[PDB]
Amino acid sequence: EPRAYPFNDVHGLTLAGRYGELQETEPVSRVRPPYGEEAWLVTRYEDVRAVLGDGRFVRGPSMTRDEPRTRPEMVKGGLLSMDPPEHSRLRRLVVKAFTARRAESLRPRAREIAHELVDQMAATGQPADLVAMFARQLPVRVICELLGVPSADHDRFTRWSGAFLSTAEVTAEEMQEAAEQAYAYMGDLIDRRRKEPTDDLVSALVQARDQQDSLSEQELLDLAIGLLVAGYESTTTQIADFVYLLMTRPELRRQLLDRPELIPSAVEELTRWVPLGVGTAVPRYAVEDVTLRGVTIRAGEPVLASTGAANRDQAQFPDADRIDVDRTPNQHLGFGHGVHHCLGAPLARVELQVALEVLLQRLPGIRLGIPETQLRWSEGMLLRGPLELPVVW
Amino acid sequence: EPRAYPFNDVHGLTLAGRYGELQETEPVSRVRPPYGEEAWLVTRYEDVRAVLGDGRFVRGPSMTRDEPRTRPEMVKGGLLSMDPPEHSRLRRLVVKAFTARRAESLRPRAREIAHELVDQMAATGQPADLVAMFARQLPVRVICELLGVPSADHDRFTRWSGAFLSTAEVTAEEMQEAAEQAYAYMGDLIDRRRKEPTDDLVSALVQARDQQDSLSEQELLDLAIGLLVAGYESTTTQIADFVYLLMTRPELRRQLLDRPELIPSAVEELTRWVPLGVGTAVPRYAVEDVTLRGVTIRAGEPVLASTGAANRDQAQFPDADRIDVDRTPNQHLGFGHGVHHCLGAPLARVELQVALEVLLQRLPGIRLGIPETQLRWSEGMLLRGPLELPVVW
Ligand SMILES: CC[C@H]1OC(=O)/C=C/[C@H](C)[C@@H](O[C@@H]2O[C@H](C)C[C@H](N(C)C)[C@H]2O)[C@@H](C)C[C@@H](C)C(=O)/C=C/C=C/[C@]1(O)CO[C@@H]1O[C@H](C)[C@@H](O)[C@@H](OC)[C@H]1OC
Ligand SMILES: CC[C@H]1OC(=O)/C=C/[C@H](C)[C@@H](O[C@@H]2O[C@H](C)C[C@H](N(C)C)[C@H]2O)[C@@H](C)C[C@@H](C)C(=O)/C=C/C=C/[C@]1(O)CO[C@@H]1O[C@H](C)[C@@H](O)[C@@H](OC)[C@H]1OC
Ligand code: HEM
Numbered sequence A, B: 001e002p003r004a005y006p007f008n009d010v011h012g013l014t015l016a017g018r019y020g021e022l023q024e025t026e027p028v029s030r031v032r033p034p035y036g037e038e039a040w041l042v043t044r045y046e047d048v049r050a051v052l053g054d055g056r057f058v059r060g061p062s063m064t065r066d067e068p069r070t071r072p073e074m075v076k077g078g079l080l081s082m083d084p085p086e087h088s089r090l091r092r093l094v095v096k097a098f099t100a101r102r103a104e105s106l107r108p109r110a111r112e113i114a115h116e117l118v119d120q121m122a123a124t125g126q127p128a129d130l131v132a133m134f135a136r137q138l139p140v141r142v143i144c145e146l147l148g149v150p151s152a153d154h155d156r157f158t159r160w161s162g163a164f165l166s167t168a169e170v171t172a173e174e175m176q177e178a179a180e181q182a183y184a185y186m187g188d189l190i191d192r193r194r195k196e197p198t199d200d201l202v203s204a205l206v207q208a209r210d211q212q213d214s215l216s217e218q219e220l221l222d223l224a225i226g227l228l229v230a231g232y233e234s235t236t237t238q239i240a241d242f243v244y245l246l247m248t249r250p251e252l253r254r255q256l257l258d259r260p261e262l263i264p265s266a267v268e269e270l271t272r273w274v275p276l277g278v279g280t281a282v283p284r285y286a287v288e289d290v291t292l293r294g295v296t297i298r299a300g301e302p303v304l305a306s307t308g309a310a311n312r313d314q315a316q317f318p319d320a321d322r323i324d325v326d327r328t329p330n331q332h333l334g335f336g337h338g339v340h341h342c343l344g345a346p347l348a349r350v351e352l353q354v355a356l357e358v359l360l361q362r363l364p365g366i367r368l369g370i371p372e373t374q375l376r377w378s379e380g381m382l383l384r385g386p387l388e389l390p391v392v393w
């Protein structure tokens, strides 16, 4: 009797038709996921937004419950699993050091990195795999620059962080040693920035103060690693998805070639339109009985709030299925909302603006080097994107 | 400048959002297929119906053209490769023998075969592969019945026919040997039926006459074996896809369990809704310059008419993306239209109605035996449906 969920087919970026049907007829409904408990699905923009910004919906039970999810393991911990007030303290300290200014300051280095990755693609010659060569490379190198990892070490961060990808084919024993080595490096680097501060993020976290608090050694170390993981896969996938769309939606490519000044606005409109997630935001749990648009969610029931479906909700975005690079307003939920709203978002926007800008500067004739019927899509089951994008230009 | 086409991915039944965009803004557009010549893609119901019904679009050049298509080899020949008047002669004789009345008379043996397969499937315990044990078994056995293959040879016949499926893992030599034996067998049976007529279809085809004309020895053979192939894979795949939908859409399962008399209507509505083909109907070729929606289609250009998109057109079907078993009217194009309209359609309706009726009658708790997200999909590249459907009940 609950619907089998996810609805989205991972082999592509198409929004499941069942969402539009639910948004009209059963905006809060019962779903059964591949693993974990039955849950409530929330689909409309107002409701998704209410849920994510209502402190009555918490994340803390995720530490002990059998969470609704697509994969048999549970991934627990980090900032996304924490509730106010301990969440709030870490976040206040991180957003103090990790500011929009600091994001903006990395644009010139992000462009240099993107151009170097295109040079390497030019050198290997066509067709070249935009996924392996650019999308999987840029986000992790940019995050290494943000944190302050010396560039001599960026190659091997890339290799370690690759073990933490939901698409990775690694043994659990290889992934564990990748994690031990990553942590050991970062703990060492935090210790070097303590004794001798630089202008990088690790130094600024070591010395951030709020009221009278500061991050502890372990907090620093978890938060640095977390930012790397949080920052990598989601950015890589969304680059791969945006290029894929530029290659398959010709009116969109033409527009941004004609008017590159529309790129920042195009990044917001694609973040809105691409239903990136296979399913929803990580489950929230009702702290007490709450009524949501006539349906009572009892205390402790999990809620799956779809930002995907929300961002395509006709009541909020007129002609919601149209990509309109000049759409205003565009208050989308693609970076979340409320206390857990993406703290990487100013940087992710810079990376996505730079990726588009540079790719269209360098490879304006870019297109798929294979038929779409032969694209391989990711079956990681967390985000939707291509495994390889062979391109010609 | 042409888009790559097909847009659909093979691994599911998702209808590409680009189809709706083209239906609104570019209902006749240039595309490039994975193999063969560039072509015109037609997507509105009116237009696809007009193409398929209009004698100016012929199939004869398929015999010598580099046809737009999804697999490297070409499958040419059979009735579908013919034009009036030779097509007309063959068809008139076939539908003389192969009547709606003959197809209905097979309902009670189809039910018996279906119960037998349910019994065999139940005996292998749960979970059971609904595809291998039921969907790939019913259509070929019923075509065997239709033709008058004696029931003792259905198992061998099923093994030969199996070699012709687009999913088949056979070598070239294996497929040739299967064809050669299937030809000799069918040859032998035709001769046996000429000497001693029975009430089966092979007998009716030997005896059928029209304006004093009749089928030759070679024609009969190729029509007989042609009916087996046209009738096997498509009905098997549509069984699999209908049952997959019933197991994943609980309200649809519920309505048909409550009201089995809705089944006929449901088979129509699902035939409409399911974009069974990866791509379009096989290409038609304009005999002379034709205008279609104000775009000039030059003589000889291939024309890809998407019955998948047509059946999903909002201009024809209110709420076209919604499955409504009581949809009326439902003038869908899932069995083609015009002179090459599916001539097995009455029998396919019988098989699909029987497949639903017997499974829901015997296994009313049937449901997936693994998460939908873990289903494996066919990569035959022609029709879409699951490779395997582990079920429990
Ligand atoms: C897809 C991105 C997402 O990926 C993840 O959640 C990472 C998932 C991988 C698959 C995990 O590794 C697997 O663990 C299994 C026990 C064995 C698998 N192999 C060995 C066979 C192995 O691959 C986790 C456990 C890996 C470790 C290093 C980890 O904790 C990674 C965390 C990273 C989380 C993320 O990078 C960020 O988390 C996501 O952030 C989004 C913004 C949230 O919306 C949400 O997205 C779905 C949330 O997803 C759970
Ligand atoms: C998707 C359904 C479609 O299947 C097909 O079209 C299936 C075609 C498969 C994919 C082909 O098999 C491949 O051939 C390759 C050269 C090698 C591959 N292996 C060995 C690596 C092999 O798998 C073709 C060649 C199979 C042969 C036996 C064949 O001619 C099959 C024809 C079957 C046609 C169909 O079963 C039905 O299509 C029929 O096509 C005829 C040509 C038409 O006249 C018409 O039949 C009346 C039409 O039905 C309405
Ligand atoms: C296109 C790229 C990105 C997308 C689409 C994205 C999306 C999101 C979303 C939707 C959330 C909220 C999840 C929820 O509430 O369930 C989130 C949180 C978060 N993001 Fe991102 N993100 C991206 C890039 C980044 C980057 C580059 C970083 C770091 C540099 C980052 C760091 C984080 C962290 C640490 C959280 C947890 C915040 C908290 O719980 O307080 N993200 N992101």
Ligand code: HEM
Binding pocket: B079, B080, B081, B091, B143, B226, B227, B228, B230, B231, B232, B234, B235, B238, B276, B281, B282, B307, B333, B334, B335, B336, B337, B339, B340, B341, B342, B343, B344, B345, B347, B348
């Ligand atoms: C659900 C199963 C079936 C579906 C969805 C289906 C669909 C179709 C379609 C859409 C066409 C027209 C294709 C075109 O014009 O390009 C066609 C043709 C054809 N069908 Fe079927 N069909 C099915 C079952 C059957 C069966 C059981 C038989 C045999 C008894 C059969 C025999 C044929 C033949 C011989 C043709 C070619 C007709 C001609 O060219 O004149 N089909 N079918």
